[PDB]
């Protein structure tokens, strides 16, 4: 369940 966005 990836998050390729900035955090």
């Amino acid at each position, epitope marked *: *369940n*990836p*998050d*390729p*966005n*900035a955090n």
Partner: antibody, heavy 121, light 114 residues
Framework: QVQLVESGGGVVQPGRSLRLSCAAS????????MHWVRQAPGKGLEWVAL????????SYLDSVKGRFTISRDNSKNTLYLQMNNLRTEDTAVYYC??????????????WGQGTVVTVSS | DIVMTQSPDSLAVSLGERATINCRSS????????????LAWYQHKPRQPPKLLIY???TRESGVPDRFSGSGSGTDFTLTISSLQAEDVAVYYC?????????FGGGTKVEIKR
């Protein structure tokens, strides 16, 4: 406006290379993963590639892996698709798009207008 | 891979009548960490880019009229158009955005039945 503007499509011979560009404006491009999606004649939408917000990882459709490279230059708010060893079945309208992988709040998508790539001799 | 399958491939609906489009994912797209389904619906007309209709399986995007609604959870999802308008003729796609390879379904072409 939040927008993406694509350029670089055209006619290209089989086996040759072509680079697409996608110029982003009106939003914080460098905060988001970004994608290419394509639609071949008579076919449905097909996701092609994903690049992390900071360029640190990429994901590819199996049929383009090793031939296509997704990259970005955040200093220019630009996304690229380098297409090498092109094949007839890569003929399509190519879209860049934000899509929704990893969304949390303040959700939006944005797509470019598309650019046509025709692989033909 | 989480692969997306839609049914039917084409649908003819009379003006003003209900349209139902189904979508199945090969694995669950429900996240155990936030209890949300990573499932979107898109509308696509010729000569323009796709438009987002629904995300989180049932959250209707700003500007989308309330005749569009999404339902389902886990692996089984439905898009309903409660009363078809002529401007709703289009190809509709489900898509999962759970993984780093966020596949679209094959699309369902919705036309007017006459």
């Amino acid at each position: 406006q939040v927008q993406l503007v694509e350029s670089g499509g055209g006619v290209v011979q089989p086996g040759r290379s072509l680079r697409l560009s996608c110029a982003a404006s009106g939003f914080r491009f460098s905060d988001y993963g970004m994608h290419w999606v394509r639609q071949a004649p008579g076919k449905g939408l097909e996701w092609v590639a994903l690049i992390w917000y900071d360029g640190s990882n990429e994901s590819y459709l199996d049929s383009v892996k090793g031939r296509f490279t997704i990259s970005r230059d955040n200093s220019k708010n630009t996304l690229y698709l380098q297409m090498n060893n092109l094949r007839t079945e890569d003929t399509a309208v190519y879209y860049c798009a934000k899509l929704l992988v990893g969304i949390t709040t303040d959700v939006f998508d944005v797509w470019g207008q598309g650019t046509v790539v025709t692989v033909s001799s | 891979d989480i692969v997306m399958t839609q049914s039917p491939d084409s649908l003819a609906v009379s003006l003003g009548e209900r349209a139902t489009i189904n979508c199945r994912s090969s694995q669950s797209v429900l996240s155990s960490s936030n209890n949300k389904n990573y499932l979107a619906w898109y509308q696509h007309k010729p000569r323009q880019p796709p438009k987002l209709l629904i995300y989180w399986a049932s959250t209707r995007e700003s500007g989308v009229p309330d005749r569009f609604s999404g339902s389902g959870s886990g692996t089984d999802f439905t898009l309903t158009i409660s009363s078809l308008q002529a401007e709703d003729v289009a190809v509709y796609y489900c898509q999962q955005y759970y993984t780093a390879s966020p596949f679209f379904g094959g699309g369902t072409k919705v036309e007017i039945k006459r």
